[PDB]
Design a protein around this ligand. Structure first.
Ligand SMILES: [Mg+2]
Ligand SMILES: [Mg+2]
Ligand SMILES: [Mg+2]
Ligand SMILES: [Mg+2]
Lengths: 176, 141, 38, 94, 136
RNA sequence: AGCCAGGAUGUUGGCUUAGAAGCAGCCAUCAUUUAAAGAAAGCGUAAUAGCUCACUGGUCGAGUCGGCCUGCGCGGAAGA
């Protein structure tokens, strides 16, 4: 609610289209569409979107705020675009990108081709560094956690695929 | 006054110059020397006196030795040879143990020409009163 | 994790959350703190 | 200074005083002086917070019943055995 | 452990524990641990808790115990018929009505009293509550 | 509540200290400069520590915190 009440501002020529509960938000860099709860009502005017409860729905505000904060980041999307970055730690751990595929070598018998979805793309300043880029905040999210999944950092060395935004506490080993 | 890059502090007395047993191997292990601790060390250690514990800077970048401008001795170093016991504590607060005073350690602390806080020398005056009390001493202030 | 009738914050970094119908403790600082079934 | 509102008691006995407490009120009494004692009902929530302050028991209180000002002092009190609540109070006209 | 040092008689009738309690006000210390429920305490129970509270205030303050056994409890053992005389005593208990002050304490910060009174409660078969001293 | 800052001086604190420099230990818990900064909050180094904290400046801009009396609910809940 502190969140929902707080307006969101559609910058330069970001075309916004509401069709009931069905928002579309296109700009410099893409186009995302979401469907809002139902107990959410969103008003478009000026160059701002606002959100507020809808008569006779308990969760009104909460639904509003989550909707609020979504559309906000939809807009950031088709505009500045998000970017997750992972780095690969451990002898032999390398990676790189044929088209919309990331070839990961993470110590298994078979290297790993990870298919990239709908609207994300990647490259690799380094053999050991991957960088996803896209408009959909919740999707570069997944992909990041998925490339991660192949080899979650281990706690005795940090060997493994990690977000760059990630601290990896390590520990000793038991005495004898 | 800049940031992190060279400084330790682990010694016994200006008396001993560079020793091996209480310290030794780690008195230089990164750009400092187990052998150089009478050169810049005694660049004014013996000139003046050898009988007061004192540590110092290290300042290290990549220039052979090191440029550690040296300075002051603690304030419980002057509770052995200027105030009372060589050891101290004992049973610190089972009774008054030892005892000092205001005259005792006024000039002995008023000296420092390279340390202490606040130009009022009635303040950094008493700043030292308590390092004779971290052992549990009586106040004849 | 540990599972028992009385679950509790153990560190200041513990957090209590409900998920599905189930009281859980998520500590951001000490895996041993993870509890379930409060 | 300590002002306590209170209407007098239409009925009496236990059935009546239990009902009283059933509906966040509780009964008390006033006595001493040459007057007949006066049976009363006080609102619970209000008198509760009053008495939480230890001047309640020291000072002379002023009980207001039917727009008349009775001056009194806390003389005794019965407390519910394990809940933080009053059961009954004795006020002394002084 | 508590228990009569001597008693006019050896065994008591089962009795019944109806009623509301007779010692209801912190009347020796600054804080009581009071019984919100009805039931029986055992010398071991009184004791296990007693230790718990004392543990928690190390050697500071003073403690009272407002309750006390005096009621002997029998039991027939395994493999015995019904009858053939009343059981053999085996422990003592104290009938508790709701509103008994159980323990009082005094000589500590209110907060620590709570802390101690807490830990002790954990050993008691009946729900309890932290009371304080009152003028009148 | 978040986030930008700071986190000090006797003092690397005397100490049954092999090394302790806040840390199982040591004993008290005082005392300087400041906006405030704990002989003490911590994951914890060979010891310096490197790094966030109790506490305080700024930013932000209106509510925020958890005890009391009570209704209905949740977990605690494994058998042929
Ligand atoms: Mg699930
Ligand atoms: Mg009846
Ligand atoms: Mg704030
Ligand atoms: Mg239940």
């Amino acid at each position: 609610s502190r969140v929902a009440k707080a307006p969101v501002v559609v910058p330069a020529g970001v075309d916004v289209k509401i069709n009931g509960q069905v928002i579309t938000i296109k700009g410099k860099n893409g186009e995302l569409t979401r469907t809002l709860n139902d107990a959410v009502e969103v008003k478009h005017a000026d160059n701002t979107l606002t959100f507020g409860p809808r008569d006779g729905y308990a969760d009104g505000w909460a639904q509003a705020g989550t909707a609020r904060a979504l559309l906000n980041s939809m807009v950031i999307g088709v505009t500045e675009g998000f970017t997750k970055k992972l780095q690969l730690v451990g002898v032999g751990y390398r990676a790189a990108v044929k088209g919309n595929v990331i070839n990961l070598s993470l110590g298994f018998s078979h290297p790993v081709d990870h298919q990239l979805p709908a609207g994300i793309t990647a490259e690799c300043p380094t053999q050991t560094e991957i960088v996803l880029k896209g408009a959909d905040k919740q999707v570069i999210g997944q992909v990041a956690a998925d490339l991660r999944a192949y080899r979650r950092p281990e706690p005795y060395k940090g060997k493994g695929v990690r977000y760059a935004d990630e601290v990896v506490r390590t520990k000793e080993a038991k005495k004898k | 006054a800049k940031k992190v890059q060279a400084y330790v502090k682990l010694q016994v007395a200006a008396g001993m110059a560079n020793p091996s047993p209480p310290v030794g191997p780690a008195l230089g292990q990164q750009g400092v020397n187990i052998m150089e601790f009478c050169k810049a060390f005694n660049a004014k250690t013996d000139s003046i006196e050898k009988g007061l514990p004192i540590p110092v800077v290290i300042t290290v970048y990549a220039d052979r030795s090191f440029t550690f401008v040296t300075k002051t001795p603690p304030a419980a170093v002057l509770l052995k040879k200027a105030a009372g016991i060589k050891s101290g504590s004992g049973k610190p607060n089972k009774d008054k143990v030892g005892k000092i005073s205001r005259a005792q350690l006024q000039e002995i602390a008023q000296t420092k020409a390279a340390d202490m806080t606040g130009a009022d020398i009635e303040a950094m005056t008493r700043s030292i009163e308590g390092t004779a009390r971290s052992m549990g001493l009586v106040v004849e202030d | 994790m540990k599972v028992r009738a009385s679950v509790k914050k153990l560190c200041r970094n513990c957090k209590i959350v409900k998920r599905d119908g189930v009281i859980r403790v998520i500590c951001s600082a000490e895996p041993k703190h993870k509890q379930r079934q409060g | 200074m300590f002002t306590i509102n209170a209407e007098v008691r239409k009925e009496q006995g236990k059935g009546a005083s239990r009902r009283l407490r059933a509906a966040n009120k509780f009964p008390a009494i006033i006595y001493g002086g040459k007057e007949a004692p006066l049976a009363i009902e006080l609102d619970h929530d209000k008198v509760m917070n009053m008495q939480a302050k230890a001047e309640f028991y020291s000072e002379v209180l002023t009980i207001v019943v039917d727009g008349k000002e009775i001056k009194v002092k806390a003389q005794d009190v019965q407390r519910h055995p394990y809940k933080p609540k009053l059961q009954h109070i004795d006020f002394v006209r002084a | 452990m508590l228990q009569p040092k001597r008693t006019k008689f050896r065994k008591m009738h089962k009795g019944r524990n109806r009623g509301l309690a007779q010692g209801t006000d912190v009347s020796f210390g600054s804080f009581g641990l009071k019984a919100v429920g009805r039931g029986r305490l055992t010398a071991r129970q009184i004791e296990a808790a007693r230790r718990a509270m004392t543990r928690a205030v190390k050697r500071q303050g003073k403690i009272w115990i407002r309750v006390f056994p005096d009621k002997p409890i029998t039991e027939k053992p395994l493999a015995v018929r019904m009858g053939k005389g009343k059981g053999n005593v085996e422990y003592w208990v104290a009938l508790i009505q709701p509103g008994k002050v159980l323990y009082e304490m005094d000589g500590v910060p209110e907060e620590l009293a709570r802390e101690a009174f807490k830990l002790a409660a954990a050993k008691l078969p009946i729900k309890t509550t932290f009371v304080t001293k009152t003028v009148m």
